[PDB]
Design a protein around this ligand. Structure first.
Ligand SMILES: Nc1nc2c(ncn2[C@@H]2O[C@H](COP(=O)(O)OP(=O)(O)O)[C@@H](OP(=O)(O)OP(=O)(O)O)[C@H]2O)c(=O)[nH]1
Lengths: 50, 51, 51, 76, 50, 249, 230, 228
């Protein structure tokens, strides 16, 4: 189902795309996994721990 | 107030002074090591990866 | 590699060589661009057979 | 020599009385009764005393002889 | 861990790539070749070393 | 909102008491950033005095962990709403749905050993957009007791402090609402009676020389903790019965 | 033996989106210039952004106006995005005064000569009361890069007015930049390439001026760099 | 508006061919933009002169052995690839080597011509044994930009050439090695500034500093179109 829906978006069905190194501009070998993940900021804040 | 002069004196004191880093479970004698400090921005301690 | 470097040359070179190894390794690891996709882990063709 | 004191221990093999000798010298340097025998690189007296030890100019015996030298000179 | 991965990637050999059977006068030329994109980072080669 | 959820997040959000939910569905008559007033439908309208329903929302109060708990109105003027619709989203809630955090574009790859271990590399772009900035509402308390040397007072007169620090205090000695402070700044001025310093001689000599009239009151004023900087959002004053309230109270 | 790049057709697909092409690029400099330009464009493009706001009845970012629905903090967040083009002067004080029911968008700001509001449709607030009226003064400065509220305190210069509401300054109009080097086969030549720089901005800097300014900055740094006084 | 221009640019040239150059302070991010631009342009596109083709009077394929030369044809090829030639006026010239007797055929043994200068007269080429010691060859030197491997000439050799025509990789670019390290540098209060360490090894012909200078010159010269 993920493969189908990714095709509906017109994106690579394997979910990896080639990325260019922002410093030099050369491409990375072997395209890498990109995509959106839901992340959380925990209550452990450096401001308090220092 | 903490103007540039204080930062210069702090830099000069820190130069050759070593500080000790320890982690609460000091298993063996390498749980305490001394390092030469490098002043950096932020509130997080940066330690060399290899160690 | 590190061990022999220590045994033949001595400390100072082993330290410098270790640092160099870290830096180069990180650089070229970044240039490699290795990642982990869902299709990279291939179910053996004969699983259901043995089952 | 603010990386590895390995060569100073190769000069003095105890690796413990080494640090004591270096402490006597570096306190004789801090309280400015004497001056560093090595061209300073804006270093503190710790690595100065270590560098002085590694070149063989100072040890326990040289420290004692020069100390009794200054003592007997100042007696006059 | 990350280091070993990088070095591992660097040293591994491949059946076929760019510049199979090229003769280089030294490692510095090898590196010059790689950084220009005229050869793959791993490819079997004859090199002069001291 | 989570891009990839499980479907339970609406149940979690509604069932928690942080959302404000409609009891008799109808049409939203007036919307403000403090109250949502809804006109109920004649169908569900109770025969005797149905009238309209008014929902007072809660704005930035301090949570148990010191985080902000404020509700924002979701619906607009003239929207028809049904019984059990989500009027205002509570903290970390969107359109009724649980939004615990935020969804970011991640790429799995080693980037020059700055993510060496489980550490994470992040782009200036996230901080620029202010999407991971939290509001923390901290409480501070200054309490004036009465020692046997004499009751302490809250006046603004604080011996040997620069008037730069006093500038932000009113004549009563309380910070103005909305003043921006930093670590070290004095919030409430307080002095305590204390005498018989018993100074050593040389201090007496110096007092003679410069004309240093010794002030019998020690300093106690509640200064802001080290390294904390924010806006004074609110002030409260509790005076016991009997004592003469001050202008600010 | 070299050639040089001349600015050829510069198409604009949308008001924000522009494609700028450079036709006579010798082999190998496609990527070099693509990357250098991308870097400078993203980092150094001078732009305008809202620096501070004064609304009358509001002491601090957390309070609330009668008859509006967005919080003061959200109104500030909305003002952060306001794209404004000032021509001559560096610091403008725009005044927005509107009353009655309706969505107050950025167009309602009193239009001054030197100031151009690129997107009048940008929403600011929604009124909900016939007599509810908001007045405010938005002070907009010129600047490059990103300066937060907290840093600007260094230059306080007697910030005494509690009415002043600081906003983080995103001093940068360029949103996105990509380049494509494609062989530009001219009927009499072997190996020449064209750079196609596709750039998306908030509609303040025109593409030509951006590219020119980037090339200028790079040229100055290379001037300093080439000479070596040992 | 107004940028920050770097000062205190010191250059400590250990081993005249090896030059390290330190440059600070640079605005955020320009460490890598300039390091990369410089490296790329210097390395891939640099006008130079180098040995391209070789003709041995004795052998038809590069894997055969000549009588009395210890080094294989591969070894002499590699020794000639490293040979640093700087020609003044003429673009492509055909140099002849004829040497006899025991010992090392060195760059000195090449015919001493006017316009072509051999910067390293003592570079070893071949070892010649006793009693036979006959070496005769024609080495062609051409001027060109960058690095071009043998494989593309042999690919694109529609001009079919006689036996013996042994192509060697043409190393035109005089910079042999170049790298740039970026490091943290603070201008007394701003920490978001960086240092550029440019390590360069060239092959004698051009001094490293001059390599840097003309590389940056040509890059700026390309950029000229827009800088007002
Ligand atoms: N661990 C490590 N050390 C490095 C590395 N690279 C260089 N070093 C050494 O660290 C020391 C730092 O020297 P510098 O900091 O550059 O000299 P400086 O104090 O006068 O400024 C040098 O040796 P030194 O202190 O002068 O040795 P010594 O003569 O004092 O015994 C240098 O050789 C490295 O990659 N890793």
């Amino acid at each position: 189902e993920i493969k189908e829906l990714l095709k509906l978006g017109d994106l690579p069905t394997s979910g990896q795309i080639r990325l260019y190194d922002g410093r030099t501009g050369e491409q990375f070998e072997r395209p890498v996994t990109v995509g959106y993940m839901y992340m959380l900021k925990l209550n452990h804040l450096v401001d308090d721990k220092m | 107030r903490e103007e540039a002069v204080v930062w210069d004196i702090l830099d000069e004191v820190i130069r050759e002074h070593p500080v000790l880093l320890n982690r609460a479970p000091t298993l063996h004698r390498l749980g305490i090591q001394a390092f030469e400090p490098v002043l950096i921005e932020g509130k997080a301690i940066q330690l060399h990866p290899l160690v | 590699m590190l061990n022999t470097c220590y045994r033949i040359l001595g400390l100072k070179p082993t330290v410098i060589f270790a640092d160099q190894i870290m830096y180069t390794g990180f650089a070229y690891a970044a240039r490699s661009g290795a990642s982990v996709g869902i299709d990279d882990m291939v179910i053996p063709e004969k699983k259901h057979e043995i089952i | 020599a603010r990386v590895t004191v390995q060569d100073a221990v190769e000069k003095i093999g105890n690796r413990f009385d080494l640090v004591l000798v270096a402490a006597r010298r570096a306190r004789q340097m801090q309280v400015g009764g004497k001056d560093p025998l090595v061209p300073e690189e804006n270093d503190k007296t710790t690595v100065i005393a270590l560098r002085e030890i590694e070149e063989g100019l100072i040890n326990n015996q040289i420290l004692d002889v020069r100390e009794r030298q200054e003592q007997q000179e100042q007696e006059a | 861990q990350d280091v070993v991965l990088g070095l591992y990637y660097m040293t591994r050999d491949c059946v076929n790539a760019k510049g199979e059977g090229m003769v280089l006068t030294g490692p510095k030329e090898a590196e010059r070749l790689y950084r220009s994109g005229l050869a793959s980072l791993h490819a079997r080669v004859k090199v002069r070393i001291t | 909102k989570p891009l990839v959820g499980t479907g339970m997040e609406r149940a979690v959000a509604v069932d928690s008491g942080v959302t404000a939910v409609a009891k008799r569905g109808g049409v939203v008559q007036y919307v403000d950033a403090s109250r949502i007033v809804i006109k109920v439908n004649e169908d569900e309208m109770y025969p005797g005095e149905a009238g309209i329903d008014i929902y007072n929302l809660t704005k930035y109060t301090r949570s148990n962990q010191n985080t902000c708990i404020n509700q924002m109105p979701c619906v607009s003027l003239g929207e028809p709403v049904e019984r059990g619709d989500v009027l205002a989203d509570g903290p970390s809630t969107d359109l009724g749905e649980l939004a615990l955090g935020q969804n970011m574009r991640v790429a799995f790859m080693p980037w020059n050993g700055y993510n060496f271990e489980d550490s994470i590399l992040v782009s200036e772009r996230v901080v620029q957009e202010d999407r991971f900035t939290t509001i923390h509402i901290q409480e501070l308390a200054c309490v004036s007791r009465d020692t046997k040397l004499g009751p302490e007072e809250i006046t603004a007169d604080i011996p040997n402090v620069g008037e730069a620090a006093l500038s932000k205090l009113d004549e009563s000695g309380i910070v103005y609402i909305g003043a921006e402070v930093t670590g070290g700044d004095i919030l409430v001025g307080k002095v305590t009676p204390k005498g018989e310093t018993q100074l050593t001689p040389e201090e007496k000599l110096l007092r003679a020389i410069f004309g240093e009239k010794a002030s019998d009151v020690k300093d106690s004023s509640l200064r802001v903790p080290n390294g904390v900087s924010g806006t004074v959002i609110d002030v409260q004053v509790f005076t016991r019965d009997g004592v003469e309230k001050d202008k600010r109270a | 033996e070299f050639l040089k790049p001349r600015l050829v057709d510069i198409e604009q697909v949308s008001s924000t989106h522009a494609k700028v092409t450079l036709e006579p690029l010798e082999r190998g400099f496609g990527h070099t210039l693509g990357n250098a330009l991308r870097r400078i464009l993203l980092s150094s493009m001078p732009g305008c952004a809202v620096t501070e706001v004064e609304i009358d009845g509001v002491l601090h970012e957390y309070s609330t106006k009668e008859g509006v629905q967005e919080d003061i903090l959200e109104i500030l967040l909305n003002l952060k995005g306001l794209a404004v083009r000032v021509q001559g002067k560096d610091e403008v004080i725009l005044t927005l005064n509107k009353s009655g029911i309706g969505p107050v968008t950025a167009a309602d700001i009193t239009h001054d000569g030197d100031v151009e509001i690129v997107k009048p449709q940008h929403v600011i607030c929604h009124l909900t009361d016939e007599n509810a009226s908001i007045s405010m003064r938005i002070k907009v400065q010129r600047g490059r890069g990103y300066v937060p509220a907290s840093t600007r305190i260094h230059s306080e210069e007697d910030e005494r007015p509690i009415g002043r509401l600081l906003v983080d300054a995103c001093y940068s109009p360029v949103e996105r930049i990509a380049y494509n080097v494609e062989a530009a086969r001219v009927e009499q030549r072997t190996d020449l390439d064209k750079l196609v720089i596709e750039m998306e901005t908030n509609g303040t800097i025109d593409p030509e001026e951006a590219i020119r300014r980037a090339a200028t900055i790079l040229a100055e740094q290379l001037e300093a760099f080439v000479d070596l006084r040992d």
